[PDB]
Design a binder for this molecule. Sequence first.
Ligand code: 9Y8
Ligand code: BOG
Length: 337
Amino acid sequence: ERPTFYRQELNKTIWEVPERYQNLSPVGSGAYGSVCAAFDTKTGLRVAVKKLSRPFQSIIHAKRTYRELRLLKHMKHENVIGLLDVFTPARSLEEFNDVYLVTHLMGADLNNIVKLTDDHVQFLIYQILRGLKYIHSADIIHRDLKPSNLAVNEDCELKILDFGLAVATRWYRAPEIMLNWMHYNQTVDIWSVGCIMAELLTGRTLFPGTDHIDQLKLILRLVGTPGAELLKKISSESARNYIQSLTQMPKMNFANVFIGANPLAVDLLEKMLVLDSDKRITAAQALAHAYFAQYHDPDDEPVADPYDQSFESRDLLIDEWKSLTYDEVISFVPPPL
Ligand SMILES: CN1c2c(-c3ccc(F)cc3)n[nH]c2-c2ccccc2S1(=O)=O
Ligand SMILES: CCCCCCCCO[C@@H]1O[C@H](CO)[C@@H](O)[C@H](O)[C@H]1O
């Protein structure tokens, strides 16, 4: 049956949680909720508890809430955030208005952790890529990988987050996103990883654009203007004509850009940071790159179970998304101790 709950007020709102969770302490807030650190008396683990804000205020919010819970319920991988628990104080669908998500407490994000040694870069990028192999295998694309969406502990264990605690986002974004391309490759994320890896190696933001146009300018300086091969695939006439009006520039030699870096790191960067998304290295191919030779184990880089995202194309009523979310809360099975 239902545990007993207790109420208290934190970050200008009421938190009602199971007694099992003790010593709540705010850690931060993001765009869709706020997070407290707590002690889970059942496991002796330190956990992060996220309370969603206004989860069912509109159709938009209600579907978002559902998307988040479905996503977090599916992730079962060491380098991806997963769900220890999900709960609501509501005893029925009728009173259901609040959702709390529980995961392992992590020490810091990669913002906060950044000068790294080459071995640390290796292990951190390895883990990112291992997590990405898993997410991508389910046909999920992150789309906003950046250092504040990557949580890390003092032993350098790393997890990909859906949303961190809120460094421009545009700095890590694939150029196709900024050109508002219709559809996206799973290697929009690889671009991001390339930007992150570069920054870990050099201690400097690779492409610190002031806006999307400045961003592309900085990108094209490094990687050069598109070639005839890439122009063949651009359906937008305005994009083509503009791209072809640019003063052409050749790709820079990355060994000179990343002076002193492990040449294996440099070689990997050159495979990530290609403008043509079809030519970027995949997360699965990257894991086998020699740069990760001390960590790569092909028998321990698993794929995910298929994930059904058909709900994304449905237009439902605010109470229907709420009821579907309530069902997900009710059917949650905790992971083993
Ligand atoms: C995992 N947590 C989290 C979460 C989070 C996300 C979803 C949940 F269900 C619970 C926490 N978002 N951001 C953080 C986070 C970011 C940087 C360092 C530490 C943390 S956290 O441990 O509070
Ligand atoms: C001026 C800089 C613009 C460079 C844009 C290059 C983006 C190229 O990547 C493109 O990604 C698409 C998936 O989104 C694919 O459908 C295309 O085949 C691929 O070439």
